[PDB]
Design a protein around this nucleic acid. Structure first.
Lengths: 134, 54, 339
RNA sequence: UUUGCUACAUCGAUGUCGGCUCUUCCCACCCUGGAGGUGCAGCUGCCUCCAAGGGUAGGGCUGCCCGCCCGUUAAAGGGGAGCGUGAGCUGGGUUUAGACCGUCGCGAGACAGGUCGGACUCUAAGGGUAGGGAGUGCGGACCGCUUGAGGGGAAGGAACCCCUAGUACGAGAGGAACAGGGUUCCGGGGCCUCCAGUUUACCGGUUGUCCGGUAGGGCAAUGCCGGGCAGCCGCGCCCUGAGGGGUAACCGCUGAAAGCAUCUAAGCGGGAACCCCUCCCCUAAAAGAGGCGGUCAGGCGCCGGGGCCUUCCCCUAGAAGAGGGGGUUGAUGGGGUGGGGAUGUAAGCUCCAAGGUUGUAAGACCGAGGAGUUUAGUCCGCCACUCCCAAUCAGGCUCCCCC
RNA sequence: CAGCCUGGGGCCUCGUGAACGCCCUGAGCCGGUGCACAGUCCGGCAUCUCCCUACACCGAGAGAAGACCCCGUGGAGCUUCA
RNA sequence: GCGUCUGAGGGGUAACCCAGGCUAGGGAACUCGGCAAAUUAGCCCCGUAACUUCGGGAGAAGGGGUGCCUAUCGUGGUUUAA
RNA sequence: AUCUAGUCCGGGGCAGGCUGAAGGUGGGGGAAACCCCACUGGAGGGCCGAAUAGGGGUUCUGACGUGCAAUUCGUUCCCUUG
């Protein structure tokens, strides 16, 4: 939303039908990557996603009122080894996303676990309720 | 900057940050160290090629 | 139903064959660009590579004024020993053949290194006088002026060889009369890379890539493994069809040699020209190469070709940006390439 | 492009749907470029024309095609090439033999109505293709370096963002573009610095086993497992402008025809992912078959030697060939010494040891294991120094044209 | 969305040692003509020879008087209210 | 008992084929179809649904322990043997 | 009718385990009707499982497909006291 003109993107992480946890207080707990915004691909190359990407998933485990529903989020946690511009390598023990409202602000009001610095700039609303940033 | 496991000197531009939910930091000289915790759980003390031997 | 697909493999470089001289040569030269007599390239060797720490010099860099990490290749730069001057002119039929050569090592150069590979001139008729003034007589009707130089690998134990290569470089500068005199001086002596280059320049690379042997189509042109079932059925590592008909069994991926090619490289900016071997030598002797003991060229990115290949360098043909000198550094990795 | 008829060709076979991979073409342009009109404030529109250089996805249902739909994207164009492609493939549809079901039949059974299974052959004579090699001519033998006719290209293409600018514009809601930067994606060419993987080089633990016990070993599709060098690739990293010329459509100007007018008729200027030149790649089998440097001696056909090749030792390289080196005037490979690495601390010795065996006691004896003896020991297709050993003996081919 | 390694083949070398396609050896490609898709014909474009390996694109490649449709006052079989 | 399921030697071993091993991250997006391949697996104990033809289903499901050594103990057999 | 189909006669085989019907016995709950538990008991066209114990040939449409052979080989299945 605000920083993607910089080095928005890193080594390949995820794919369609990839399952991630919901790290907030929204009510959703488990979600599967259903689609990728923006990206355009080529023959047989599965579409991509990593940290700080407008991503589209659906609710698999969570409150019934959100079960089997469509919502937007951003990617905050990945297991991939990758190289930061200052040449450090960051990883997250699992893969998590935070659901965002269609305007851009997160739907949830709480944040679970650390987030790589990159998401905060691309989504300052996330940084608004962000607790710790790595 | 010291390895979480072998603790030895980390010559710059390598290693990997495996950040947990707690925000703790894990530093590995190579793959040997990373396996030493994330999957081996073996004792750093139990061996004698890390300074934490005794 | 016949979905879109870019033609796979690279049709641009057909034919793909192996070079006939280990040390290639440029076929064009970037313009002189309004300056004085000096050379436009250099020779060297591929010693190894590492990663380096610098402040960004690109004024428009997104990383400007910060320390970022970047792989960097080392190029030992042994001194160059010139041989002769070659005359090119619009001859009969309006072509640019060699008018004449101008050799001189009888006045200086009691070196049998050249003798190892060429049974070169004797003192009996070292009468280049009538040759040299021929240039003077043919002055003002000359177009290009290259230079005969040789490498001196015997000053580098890393490459266990003693018969050297003699190769060419075209010189641009001010007036033609100046250039010949400029070259005339350079004969019979030794020339450092600093005599041609300075830090912060761009440089071009033509050389021979890492050979690989006869290859497979899977590897040669990155053709695709057939899906699933062929990993079990009738064969997997081949293209299915080979053309609509004998109407040109065409430029299609077919096996053959890959590597050892004459190739190209653009937009390479140097980092450091140091002279202390201890500043760059890694731990335990650089891998597969030895211990650099002459002046070296600190070039980032990747450089084509296998270790222990001569490399011939060149000014930028289509430089992307005009660089300033000295992208200062902050760290050099002396750690073992092993481990 | 289908679909209707035609039976001219194929019945001693042109093997039939789809799909997969892979190549190319075409333009009736989906997007990207150029120009314009508009019931075009701007964005979004709608439409015409030129333009085939490039791109034109990923999924669900259906075997397909078709069709319906999901979420992005610039859109997710349509057709050909024996409905491109089985001596490249899948057999899902469909063309047999077994059965069931529905309609009809007294019956053999028929159905174009549905459903389960049902064999997919070939060592490339010749060409094409992709590489790699010998020779003749170009011209006596050579060694070396170069000129650079044509050949191919997409060697780049695309999007998003920063600021322009919350500006222009519109009352407002809303909301531009030029240049300039940058990023990403896809594609193209490289490379292993680091990371990931790889590691039947190596090291350890450890089951079962036997070789008398330890040790050291055989084996058990590396016995299993843990680790990881180099090398190689990737999920890693690096490079991947623009301009000059001629043009399309068209936009102009000077201008008569035809006094005026008229962009056009001659005349003149601009004007595109359009064609070419600059870029890279292979080129003296280019027949005009190039040029330049040097040597081929010396002496009396002869002596002689000079060049080259093989042989020799290796690897920058690889199917051999080739290519690159070295060859006593030497660091090319082994040895040795150091250097830097991988495993993870050799044996034996000592001490301790859950308890027990003794032994009057004292003491000594067994014991899976822990510690020191010890960043050990083993190993390292890596580096340097060191002439200790090895590059010799030998064979072949050939020049004396020039004085 | 591909990658590395191992055994046997495949590479090479000694020995043994076949069969298939053969009017031919004269077959490069492109338009054209013609049984309406050529190796010879027509018009161009090129095109030095020899050798080895990989590819099966073509040779309307080879394998088999097509398993389908129909004809023959041709068979066989089955059935019945012939 | 065999080195006779009877041809062998060279090599840094190209591609490729057949047998395999292993692959980060995602985990059916491939695909007509999860085909293949993988995962589990011996044993003891605990614990075990709906339904039903009451017999099973039923190794339903699921959970826990399993080595090596220093000791022991219990049970039973056996030797002319309550 | 040395193959196969069938039958008859006379012969030769199915390593090891598991499961546990009937019945028997003893506890225990209540005078009863009889019920629960423990063991014993060893019935069944029952179950797992020995490449070549023996049988069939299931998927890999897996290799060969001018063979190991004019019907196989390796994988990979189901049966095994009737």
């Amino acid at each position: 939303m605000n920083v993607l003109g910089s080095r928005k993107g890193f080594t390949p992480a995820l794919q369609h039908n990839s399952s991630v946890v919901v790290a907030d207080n929204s009510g959703a707990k488990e979600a599967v990557i259903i689609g990728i915004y923006g990206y355009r691909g080529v023959l047989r190359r599965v579409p991509f996603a990593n940290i700080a990407d407008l991503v589209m998933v659906s609710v698999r485990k969570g409150s019934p009122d959100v079960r089997k529903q469509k919502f937007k989020a951003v990617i905050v946690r990945q297991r991939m080894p990758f190289r930061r511009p200052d040449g450090t390598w960051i990883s997250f023990e699992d893969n998590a996303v935070v659901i965002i409202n269609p305007d851009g602000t997160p739907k949830g009001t709480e944040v679970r676990g650390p987030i790589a610095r990159e998401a905060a700039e691309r989504w300052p609303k996330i940084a608004s309720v962000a607790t710790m940033v790595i | 900057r010291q390895c979480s496991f072998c603790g030895k000197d980390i010559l710059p531009g390598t290693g990997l940050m495996y950040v947990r939910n707690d925000g703790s930091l894990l530093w590995f000289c190579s793959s040997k160290c990373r396996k030493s915790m994330l999957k081996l759980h073996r004792d750093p003390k139990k061996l004698k090629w890390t300074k934490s031997y005794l | 139903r016949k979905l879109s697909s870019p033609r796979r493999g690279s049709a641009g470089l057909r034919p793909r064959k192996r070079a006939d001289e280990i040390l290639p040569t440029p076929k064009n030269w970037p313009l002189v660009n309004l300056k004085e007599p000096k050379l436009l390239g250099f020779i060297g060797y591929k010693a190894g590579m590492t990663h380096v720490y610098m402040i960004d010099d690109k004024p428009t860099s997104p990383n400007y004024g910060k320390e970022v990490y970047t792989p960097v290749t080392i190029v030992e730069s042994p001194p160059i020993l010139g041989l002769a001057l070659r005359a090119y002119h619009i001859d009969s039929k309006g072509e640019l053949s060699v008018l004449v050569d101008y050799w001189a090592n009888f006045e200086e150069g009691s070196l049998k290194y050249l003798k190892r590979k060429i049974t070169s001139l004797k003192v009996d008729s070292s009468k280049m006088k009538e040759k040299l003034d021929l240039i003077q007589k043919n002055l003002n009707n000359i177009t290009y002026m290259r230079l005969l130089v040789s490498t001196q690998p015997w000053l580098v134990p890393s490459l266990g060889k003693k018969r050297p290569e003699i190769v060419e470089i075209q010189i641009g500068g001010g007036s033609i009369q100046d250039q010949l005199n400029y070259g005339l001086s350079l004969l019979g002596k030794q020339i450092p890379v600093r005599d041609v280059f300075r830090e912060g320049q761009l440089t071009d690379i033509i050389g021979v890539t890492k050979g690989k042997g006869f290859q497979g189509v899977i590897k040669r042109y990155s053709v695709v493994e057939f899906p699933r079932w062929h990993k079990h059925r009738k064969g997997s590592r081949k293209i299915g069809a080979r053309g609509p008909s004998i109407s040109t069994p065409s430029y299609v991926p077919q096996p053959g040699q890959l590597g050892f090619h004459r190739r190209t490289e653009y937009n390479k900016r140097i980092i450091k020209i140091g002279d202390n071997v201890n500043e760059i030598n890694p731990a335990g002797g650089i891998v597969n190469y030895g211990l650099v003991k002459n002046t070296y060229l600190v070039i980032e990115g990747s450089v084509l070709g296998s270790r222990k290949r001569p490399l011939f360098l060149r000014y930028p043909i289509r430089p992307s940006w005009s660089p300033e000198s000295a992208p200062k550094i902050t760290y050099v990795n002396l750690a073992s390439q092993q481990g």
